[PDB]
Design a protein around this ligand. Structure first.
Ligand code: G1P
Ligand code: G1P
Ligand code: G1P
Lengths: 390, 390, 390
């Protein structure tokens, strides 16, 4: 039969209002405020956390403030291990009410809510990003959200901690928590190496032309949304590659200019004409390496025939010192993918190359380069096949 | 007087929580999961559908699973007709409760919910996209959502079916169901015909340059959100025109390059200078033809003075073989409109034309062309006049 | 302890469901429909308003319709003043219920809701945009939303009124009320003045080239979202500057072309080569002037090291009559900031200038120029420091 959920004779249940709040949360779970570590009230037997509010699959969880310590987690038995401090909902447990709504004595012991320590494989098997209490095919009764990486030393010491920022809805994403900006940067200048194919460094360090003979590695302002992407964990790829943490249709915006761009000089032999040189800027995705995602989680496999390289700007140098470019594209990206930008041109400086033989400010370089990477759509259901290949 | 809805002494009603869920749904109705046809349990007297969940103007509807068939719809009396299988809310009916919340016997017969067959004019008169239970000026008591086109044959046969995907929130749009991407494509190459004005084919087939003498019609990956737009239903316009299904402020992104671009050769007569040739890429809207929208529904009339053509890229060829371009614009579009892209240049190849006299890969063509069309704003209330004209 | 809000044994409270509706509203408050002035039922002792619905920090407020006047506000004692007509929630008051749910006589006198007149300093001290009932650090018990600027004359006269459109969710923003388009325009042509640095007029009037000798100030279609931005209130800056009303990460899109662009003519002395001329289009922010925001409200101070100028397009003229450009950037903007676009080039027309010595259609000008400014992210919490500087 046809069942009404919100109708005149319907009884609105807890599962119902959680499903509504989850929808309003864009199916994202996370700490809405507070719930950060309290080192002052942290010992070698107890871990303390400040008061706050979180939403886990539509269920509102609160750590209440009083008098501090707002809450205490038992660390006895935990030594010489790296654990995950998790907030867990266990629907197998029973919430115990006491007193009465008539007197002013109603209270509940929420045994369905736990603050605990889990190892990485245990958390992954009950992580909200991968499993759901509300799931259609595999509904679960126990779900968790990791708050902190906790590294316990020898018995009698206080532990080391690292916030799992992907699980905190801190700021930048309020209103559209599952979408918005993934990565963005300020304008930067980067020297073009004398090679056919090279990546453009999008992670905060550029090889900035500083003099007529040299370029030097210089920081530039960059921002990343930890829920959507992260800097590659391997030092070889760290300057260039992003690891995508969330499946979706993303929008990539690029702009800048190619300064000291090479071209064949107009001479009597070529009928006093500029010999333009081909170059292209491409965006790329690579999924050959598994476990790049947070917690070394399993990558999401892309559909058959998925793109790997896409031309954002393809043209010839026009005989000017500096020539501007701009591009905007929507692309499919998968959890675990590597995402990066490449600069492609010929290697013969006297024939097909967009780059010259100069170094530093005398050499061909990218000037005023910037980008924005944003999540603009999901790949749930049919979209995975229809929209996921490009 | 001033009435509080959510206040301490207020009674939260069914209409109230439906209005809240509708707001959380971005005022969009549709199947959230399941509710697809079950051909195995479909006969010549009954139509079967799988279990699922839908939200119709804030009212949650569920088809419950048990033992299949999850639900059965009586098809007796339906023959040699094309009908719409609809999910209807009728607030004139009375939901009948039985048993008690005290025992574990409470049940409701939701007579306010129906699975029925309607003809196209009947559905349109009570379609959720055009009429509302919550409406300010014309509030309705009966509202429907079409799920399937059902074509019944002769008495004793099983019918033919077609899913109304615009009414299924399948994927790509979760989180922002009323907005997001309307249409997008992968990079493609398209030969420029030797005419003054031509449309660029945005519906999946391009006239791809394949040799030095020929171009051939080749498919390219394209995606459309059925709720926002569709391929033109008339074969003459099918390669080029989109039909907009939903009013709004849309964002159009284009990029690519013009390859083998024509120009006046630098000669002694012109002081050894490149004679650039003007061309422009425009986006366009046309509402002359009514009933192009889904179900042949009535178009939404645009305000007085509305734009029809807008220049996205206007410039001269620069003497290079290939020159890249990019553009991003926000435009107003109305339900029933035709939306398309045009390439405009002169017809005299020796004087004003951006195109040459070559064919295939030797002829002027668009290379690496792609676009994204996205809904970024609505045209409700005052916005219709203020923002709707451009 | 860990408290559950939405769990099986939990009691869902009024504050709870208001917090849920506020989240669903993207933390924006405003009139959802109606609540506009009723001049017909307005006297010299009373102000009338039409029926409608508003949401103030998750609390639903309704003015009920019956027989008009839908509601009356006492204006006795108000003379020779400019007041703000405000809708206030005061949680210190007590809502008085009467009758019973058993009979059909339940009614509430919502003393927690008021329609009143406040002076600008009083409203600012209890304005929903700046203070919250739900606030973590400074929770308030009284909060208001301004609906109209009301200017009372001499005793015995009807007042003058001005709608506070920023507090009305009229249209264009339904679905994403706190985000979406801030400002947009149709394509326009603007003459480039013979100076090093000039602003491009983004507020609806351009100096349009009309003849071979003259340009004239001509209107062009422009739209602004009052909640996000406004035209500068000072006449000196009115054609060029926007005042940002809301903190955030914004996206700026620009496109157009530079027509009649200057360049050094190819002559025997320069080896028959085009001497390109540098120019740049920049977007800018300035916060030196306080109180530019609505109600002369205090500006939001940007973090240390914040950007002020950013290059969107930087390149040389290429020897063509017309050369197109496009740019897309994400930038940080603060409540009270001035936002504007500048055109920068050299002043020596025979050496470094992108502009020539012509006027009107014979002079260098921007052609088909348009832009979109959109709010794409917030600057709450950590984002203020991490993302706010660029
Ligand atoms: O090209 P290879 O060695 O297969 O692949 C390597 O470079 C790619 C491109 O940066 C990375 O995405 C891969 O994770 C890495 O294994
Ligand atoms: O130019 P015509 O014949 O008025 O109009 C025709 O072409 C337009 C442009 O493709 C379409 O939008 C119209 O639906 C069609 O009737
Ligand atoms: O340059 P000045 O005089 O400091 O600053 C003036 O021009 C700026 C740029 O238009 C405005 O933002 C300022 O509000 C105004 O005071």
């Amino acid at each position: 039969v046809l069942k009404g959920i919100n109708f005149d004779r319907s009884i609105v249940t807890p599962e119902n209002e959680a499903s509504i709040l989850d929808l309003a949360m864009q199916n994202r779970s996370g700490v809405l405020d507070g719930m950060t570590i309290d080192i002052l009230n942290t010992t070698s037997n107890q871990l303390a956390l400040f008061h706050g509010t979180a939403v886990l699959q539509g269920y509102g969880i609160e750590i209440t403030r009083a008098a501090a310590p707002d809450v205490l987690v038992d660390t006895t038995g935990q030594s010489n291990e790296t654990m995950l401090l998790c907030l867990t909902i266990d629907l197998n447990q029973v919430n115990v009410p006491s007193g009465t709504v008539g007197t002013n004595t109603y209270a509940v012991d929420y045994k369905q809510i736990r603050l605990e320590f889990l190892d990485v494989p245990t958390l992954l098997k009950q992580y909200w990003r991968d499993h759901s209490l509300h799931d259609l095919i595999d509904p679960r009764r126990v779900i968790s959200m990791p708050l902190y990486w906790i590294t316990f030393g020898q018995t009698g010491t206080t532990p080391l901690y690292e916030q799992i920022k992907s699980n905190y809805i801190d700021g930048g994403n309020s209103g559209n928590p599952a979408y918005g900006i993934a990565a963005r940067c300020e304008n930067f200048n980067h020297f073009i190496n004398k090679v056919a194919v090279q990546s453009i460094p999008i992670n905060g360090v550029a090889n900035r032309p500083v003099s007529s003979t040299a370029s030097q590695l210089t920081n530039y302002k960059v921002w990343r949304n930890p829920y959507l992407c992260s800097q590659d964990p391997r030092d070889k790829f760290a300057p260039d590659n992003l690891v995508i943490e969330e499946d979706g249709i993303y929008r990539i915006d690029i702009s800048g200019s190619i300064n000291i761009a090479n071209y064949t000089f107009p001479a009597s032999g070529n009928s006093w004409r500029v010999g333009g040189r081909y170059f292209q800027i491409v965006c790329a995705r690579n999924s050959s390496a598994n476990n790049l995602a947070e917690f070394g989680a399993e990558q999401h496999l892309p559909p058959s025939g998925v793109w790997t390289r896409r031309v954002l700007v393809g043209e010839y140098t026009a005989g000017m010192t500096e020539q501007a470019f701009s591009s905007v594209a929507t692309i499919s990206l998968f959890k675990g993918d590597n995402f990066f930008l490449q600069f492609e041109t010929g290697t013969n400086t006297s024939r097909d190359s967009a780059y010259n033989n100069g170094y530093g400010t005398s050499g061909t370089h990218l000037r005023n380069f910037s980008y924005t990477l944003e999540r603009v759509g999901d790949l749930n259901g049919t979209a995975y096949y229809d929209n996921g290949t490009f």
